[PDB]
Design a protein around this ligand. Sequence first.
Ligand SMILES: CC1=[NH+][C@H]2[C@@H](O1)O[C@H](COS(=O)(=O)[O-])[C@@H](O)[C@@H]2O
Length: 507
Amino acid sequence: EIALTPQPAHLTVKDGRFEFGNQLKAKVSIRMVFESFKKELQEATGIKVSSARIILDLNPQLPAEAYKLNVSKKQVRIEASRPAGFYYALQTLKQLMPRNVMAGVATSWSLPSVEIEDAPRFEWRGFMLDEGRHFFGKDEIKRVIDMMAIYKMNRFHWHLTEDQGWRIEIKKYPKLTETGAWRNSKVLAYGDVKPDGERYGGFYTQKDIKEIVAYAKKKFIEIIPEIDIPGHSQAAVAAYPEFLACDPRDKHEVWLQQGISTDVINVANPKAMQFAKEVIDELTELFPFNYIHLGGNECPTRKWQKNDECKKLLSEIGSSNFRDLQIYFYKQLKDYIATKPADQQRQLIFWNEVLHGNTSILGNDITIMAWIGANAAAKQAAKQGMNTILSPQIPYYINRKQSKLPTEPMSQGHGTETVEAVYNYQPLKDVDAALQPYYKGVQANFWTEWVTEPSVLEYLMLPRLAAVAEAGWTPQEKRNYEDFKERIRKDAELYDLKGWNYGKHIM
Ligand SMILES: CC1=[NH+][C@H]2[C@@H](O1)O[C@H](COS(=O)(=O)[O-])[C@@H](O)[C@@H]2O
């Protein structure tokens, strides 16, 4: 009957139903949010709402994303403290209606009376897409954002730079795309799989970026760009080897392989430093959200050990751990950002491998995205007074196989990462109440070594995405896989109407 995903914190079914009619009147940034709602509602149902049987009141004691939704025979009442809260209330309202309403599509109207009080458990409810390995483009990204918005996810992490490609136009360094965005293989080589010789790639112009930022903002999704440095940087090194390469005498090309590249940025070169600062400057212009992800995963120190300037620099900082070069590199970038005006300042996120270095050089106002040995890494981060986001490889990497069936498309894993396994992960299990404030939230990540087709992307994304979304929103004590299964089954219709692909295993 009522199938709400994410499951609200508190839901009480009440007497009777609220009948819309064909018109009604509403008492109300908030107006613009409601305006959007009105458009979608009219599109889907034909109901017109004039500017009262619907009231939106400001309740300043509610958290930033919280709301109350009271539906009775007489009236729909909504309370929230911020625009986002009102948006989420209206998401829930739509979800109380036939699926075509959430789909925004007319088909060939009442609400059940309810009392809802709702707030997200976590402020960070994210999805990351890797477009470095395979590029999907503007239309598909809009579809991804649409999927996220359904389940009240609010953070899109854009993994735009890799060994195998660079996907964002940087004005001051045009070769990043000219070289970095194109390569002579669609598939990425691994084991017996060899490069296929086909010219393949693509990138976003700064105009494209701004359009996608705007589109997401309308659905209260903030975009975090990732420029993954100084590892996972072979494409950038291929573009500008003279100052980025540790070994600029050697050949440097965009990588056609899967795996971990040793062709990392020369963090000791001064022009490499200037490059990074100027990239960050351009990002600051395109991305208004207050966070930047600088990566820091899987960065072999091997080439630094064979580089004279790097050996010298490591000596001057008085370290025996070549990992410290990476951390010192981040320090200079962090310091640089701190000199800029307040409105141009950005907080930094890193993958948890950065904890393997002497991080006290950086300070503790960084955010750690925990992926490998994630549970332990997050605890480690929280203990050091750092904020942390949980994105464990198992089971939050939703590019991994969701089934063992021989008919599944090719991707990583052995099919153990089922909807059930994703849902059953408990982010806060055995996490001391004193550490919990540092846990900003959760994220599903999607790596695209194997995934090249939008249809396969969607197939793997859904419905596991919704499970992570619910984990991020619904308090643990209110979560239940069997209940979730029953609720998510109702979204098959929504997916069909939207023309989204999805795994059918639990449908
Ligand atoms: C943060 C991070 N760095 C690595 C690591 O996660 O696994 C990804 C693939 O994971 S998967 O699909 O489970 O094998 C890989 O694409 C990425 O380069």
